[PDB]
Design a binder for this molecule. Structure first.
Ligand SMILES: Clc1cccc(COc2ccccc2CNCc2cccnc2)c1
Ligand SMILES: Clc1cccc(COc2ccccc2CNCc2cccnc2)c1
Ligand SMILES: Clc1cccc(COc2ccccc2CNCc2cccnc2)c1
Ligand SMILES: Clc1cccc(COc2ccccc2CNCc2cccnc2)c1
Lengths: 396, 396, 396, 396
């Protein structure tokens, strides 16, 4: 059992383990595009000796955090352990090697999407975004008198074929991802993959349509089996007007009984309707997970709420140092100290606070972060809150 | 079609309309207890002429709002319109009469639980608490190393018969309701009803058990049909330790596959587990709805977040006045003005902000409140936030 | 194995066989009321020797046929064969004895409700009414501009407790049953049973309500498990206005998603709505079955359509005689003949034609009645049609 | 927003709107065949300005009505409104333009299949045929002793590959469509489409088989997911013997538990079995909708029942003229008059009467047609009845 960077000769063993580990992995063409995002030395394999029994890698991503700050981010992906090689510490060894490489390379954060909720907390990843599925019974849906774009005259929204408006989608998404915490840069090769998945599949997904506004798009397809359900795969709106105009068009899908979307907890959709209850939360789950690799670099990089007055404290991360933390005028300074800790928490907890998806008060009540000062808790809650609701860009 | 306060002679017609309108209304004994909470002149009936074709009433309640302030609250309840008398403006007429009586009597707020989401917004009620159902697959549930009360030795929690510990439940609930926004005083007659519903029913609900801690209780019963589901009807914990100790005991129900509870969005339960995902959000809905009857009395009564610096603005409520609003040191002053409005919203929107369940930013993005100042929005969001998460006491 | 009229001593053995044969038979009190309708000599039992292994009986009923003619009718009921005594010709022997007694007593017709569709055709019973279940999604239901009773002002319909308006229900039903083919006289003891079943049952059916109009009533109850379904057990309307007024009230049950009723194929309900499709046929089945005991007495008793000109033919019933049949001015004369048959059919087929539920043309296409004259077929179709749609009164 | 006949350049915008509006529309090849049936000027588009936001067209069809009379019929089809352009009166404008063109061209009737039941009544279309799904549990099915073709010896029915017997299917269907009200001429291009859909589809429908008799065929395929269900897509029988012989063969599909077919309410199938109840009505819905474009041309074209004696009345269609209507010897004369109306109804109601699927008495009880004469009602019922049951040919 060696742990090595793979050679070109290891990739067929990796594609077999991938096919056996992930139902979405059709074959080598499935990894082509993603693989242009893996740097040299971004991948490890475990061999028996020899055949591939374990693999993991990271992609070079750009993640938007509160204050519209974009961080270089190591996106852990393609992590699999052969069903023959369970319980042999292979995931631990692969994550320790990649974390060493990611830290040495200068990434301040790593990120992933978790197949299960119980695996990555012990490696320092905290869930940092929340997926919220809304299902609208569009047959009862009426827009509130206050809702934007109720005026008579031309619609600002067009129904279009996705592949014919790639430039517009790219430009709208680039604006969206730079203004929203959770935003990811989407490289050309991932736009190629997204547009390929928009075509009908022989006995698979139905054809995707787009609704296009100058300041937003929705990409939607009818469910393969439930022919009265439209699933909105993606909806990116840069203005409130674009968001409302797109939902007026989706609620105009008169063939459908139900429109479903995976969105975030602060989606204003329900408030656009005379009956907020028509926007049923049908599913909730963790989205993006974060591991803070460098505590001071990460805490100083993000912007903080201007509404909390200057304060200083001492934060200890369980295996990640102790720091004098001063937050004022929306900026943090975070410097080494041996002064007594006023706040303690594990690395994963800081990841869960970092984008504003989880309140410090909520984690304190679970004893995941410890402090004897209730005032300090309220100040942390207020300071780490994000003005712009955190959203989830796209899985990887 | 007259609208009158009912006489003793009207109540049998009211019990018939009740039985036909609400599946939970077994008969007159169903209204006995609740009815001690209806003041003189708290009830209206509509007669055809004569028989009862419409009814509505309010109960005298005490509602806890942020800052642990308790307001006299008119709880609208028993609102029904005969299926023969639909679309005749009877609900509008009954709500206008009760609102006149409630305002003249000096209540600063009214409240209700809505049978449907599309009815009460137009009468000025906004949804103000959020019910969140969590279903735990307790067979996988393990407590995080950080979770309180993991030590060996005696359990602080006892399994008890509800009717034998009424005094302890009352005392714990009284402490809970005074510290949590959404808390309601629960009078003796509602404790009598709650303890009666704890007994097994011939071909109905199974027997209720209690888990009792010095600082919390849970009341739970196995589902009538799904014998592997335990439903926690109520869980009131005054400390984090009590909340964790009670959940350790509920996860010790080894007969069960699943524990379900109707809780609030900030329930720390998920964070107590090594897998946060085991705490599935299976259902979300509006809980308590508020109508602000007197804008200045309500805005001055509640406490505001100390973390936002002093600010002044001009708020117009659509049919509810215009006010100079100054918020600093956790207190608001709210005085008449004809100065230009900086913020506008309908009455229902203010009700939805009032307990901190909905952010001003979220309602602004839906255009339910209008302002041209993004700084003012962030300040409102921060000021109206509740330190203690808003919860739902009990339906009425 | 003797076949005898039962003595008082046989009835406990009969109640045991009943309880084991019919899930609805709670105990002796279940047969008390019905049993006042069984004449002396209306019952047979088969004993092993001794214990009751077979039973059958008939009740004295009054059945309305086209032309508003009321016939004395033998209602076969309480027919059971012990599961130990299957395939021993016991049903055949019991039906031959009762048919002899019914014929000798002077009944022109027998009738029953069939537990299964494959049993009674061979004993000469044809299905003669059609049960049609309509389920309305009342949330979309809007009344057509043409629909009666759309005017503003008092409703002619009242919501009432069934037991307090027994006199009105009785009078409306008596008018209904005399004007509709399929109508049955409902004696006092069956009104006692109907009103008893209207009360809530400990872990059984929910309480029944009534909607009362001067010229119609509906009796409805919410489903025991599906709390958004109202089931209309009975709806008797003497005028079109009463039928429309009652459906406006049922569609005013705003708590409900769906209203279901067992009605007949010509129920005008769908045509009252702007969307006829909201009235989904969810179930169809045979209702009342008829055996014509005396062919000439039955054919001369009913009225025929005035719109077909006088015609004469020769009808042979397979074991029931050959007859010169002359139909004109809405009356038939039906006299013995040995002239060549122009129409042939079995006894059950005549029962299926007799109330107008089945067309002669439809039965001819299945070869259940044979004729070489297509003109004679059209004339029979037209003559046996019922002006007033055939309905089903109540099961027995 | 212009409304224009489309140019060749408009058809790609029309195919996109089609793909987004109808799940069955795979792509341009889906409209090729149908489109040979659209005359010059048979199509309208609505453009924003430009892109296609609305479309509708009619095909040249031949519809059989009672008396075996074949009418030129405008079949409205391909009607779609972009989800972005809802509630802008686009369907009303398109239907008014096509109705003007259809009337000017000399069609006496228009027809369509409705996506929803609440849309087309207001444009004068009444539902005129009734789809009736029968599901047979073929494991219990036994043919009645009376049923044709029970004799020993060769079967008159063969199991065949559809594509190898196109000539026989065409000839049988041509005979069927000329003798049955609801029959449509099926042009060569629709036989090409039907035979293409008979082949297995990669992850779609299973292969179709045929059962072939000299005087009838059935085309059936096993359900894609329920492998014990055979769905009969089409069954066309010119004689009762052919209908019975085909059902004996379908009930010989010993692999299957259930045979389902979409048929008409007078299908004799149930009467062929010893248990009529084995033929469960599992679904009922409107089929073909009719708009009478020229009242006198339509009323004079169809044949009427010979069994009703000569009568005269005055019929007013709400926006369609008033007429002296005389019906005798199976023929109507229908001439302009200003004499007082004895019968009134909207245009859609006449469409619903026209093929005999709905009785005048049933529509009168819903107040959809008004008369003060009950004798006149019975005469209309009898006169508009169809000797041959109305059936549905094929959707368009
Ligand atoms: Cl060489 C390489 C590098 C990074 C990612 C991959 C592709 O991983 C796939 C591809 C298809 C299905 C499943 C997976 C693995 N699950 C995560 C994931 C990734 C991408 C899209 N959706 C989900 C290949
Ligand atoms: Cl005289 C009076 C005054 C106020 C409330 C009542 C009782 O109302 C009932 C009782 C039982 C079932 C349903 C309802 C009405 N739905 C609201 C509600 C109320 C109480 C408990 N759960 C739900 C009677
Ligand atoms: Cl002594 C006698 C005479 C005639 C009928 C009876 C009662 O028969 C019952 C009673 C309850 C349940 C089931 C049955 C039998 N199924 C037919 C039926 C009858 C009445 C009401 N619903 C259904 C008893
Ligand atoms: Cl250019 C033109 C003219 C007339 C009809 C069409 C095709 O319309 C299609 C084709 C496939 C699926 C759905 C539709 C529209 N729904 C009605 C329909 C029509 C034909 C077959 N089944 C249903 C194209």
């Amino acid at each position: 059992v060696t742990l090595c960077s793979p050679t070109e000769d290891d990739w067929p063993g990796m594609f077999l383990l991938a096919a056996a580990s992930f139902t979405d992995f059709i074959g080598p063409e499935s990894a082509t595009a993603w693989r242009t995002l893996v740097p040299t030395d971004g991948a490890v394999v475990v061999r028996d000796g020899s055949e591939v029994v374990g693999m993991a890698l990271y992609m070079d991503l750009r993640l938007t955090v509160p204050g519209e700050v974009v961080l270089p981010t190591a996106g852990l992906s393609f992590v699999a352990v052969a069903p023959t090689h369970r319980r042999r510490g292979l995931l631990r060894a692969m994550c320790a090697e990649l974390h060493r490489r990611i830290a040495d390379s200068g990434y301040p954060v790593a990120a992933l999407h978790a197949s299960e909720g119980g695996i990555y907390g012990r490696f320092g990843y905290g869930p940092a975004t929340t997926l919220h599925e809304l299902t609208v019974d569009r047959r009862f849906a009426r827009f509130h008198a206050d809702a934007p774009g109720g005026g008579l005259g031309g619609s600002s929204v067009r129904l279009v074929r996705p592949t014919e408006h790639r430039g517009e989608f790219e430009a709208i998404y680039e604006r969206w991802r730079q203004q929203v915490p959770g935003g990811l840069l989407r490289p050309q090769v991932l736009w190629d993959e997204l547009l390929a998945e928009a075509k009908a599949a022989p006995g698979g997904d139905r054809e995707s349509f787009a609704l296009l506004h100058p300041d937003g798009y929705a990409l939607y397809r009818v469910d393969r089996t439930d022919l009265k359900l439209a699933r909105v795969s993606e909806l990116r709106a840069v203005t409130a007007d674009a968001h409302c105009a797109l939902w007026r068009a989706l609620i105009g899908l008169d063939s459908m009984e139900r429109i479903s979307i995976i969105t975030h907890p602060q989606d204003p959709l329900p408030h656009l309707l005379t009956d907020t209850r028509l926007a049923r939360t049908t599913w909730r789950q963790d989205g993006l997970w974060l591991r803070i690799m460098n505590v001071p670099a990460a805490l100083e990089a993000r912007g903080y709420a201007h509404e909390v007055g200057e304060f200083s404290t001492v934060l200890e991360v369980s295996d990640g140092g102790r720091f004098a933390l001063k937050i004022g005028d929306g900026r943090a300074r975070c410097t080494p100290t041996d002064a007594a800790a006023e706040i303690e928490m594990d690395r994963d907890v800081l990841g869960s606070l970092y984008l504003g998806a989880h309140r410090a008060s909520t984690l304190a009540a679970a004893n995941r972060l410890r402090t004897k000062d209730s005032q300090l808790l309220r100040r942390l809650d207020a300071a780490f809150a994000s003005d712009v609701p955190v959203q989830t860009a796209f899985e990887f």
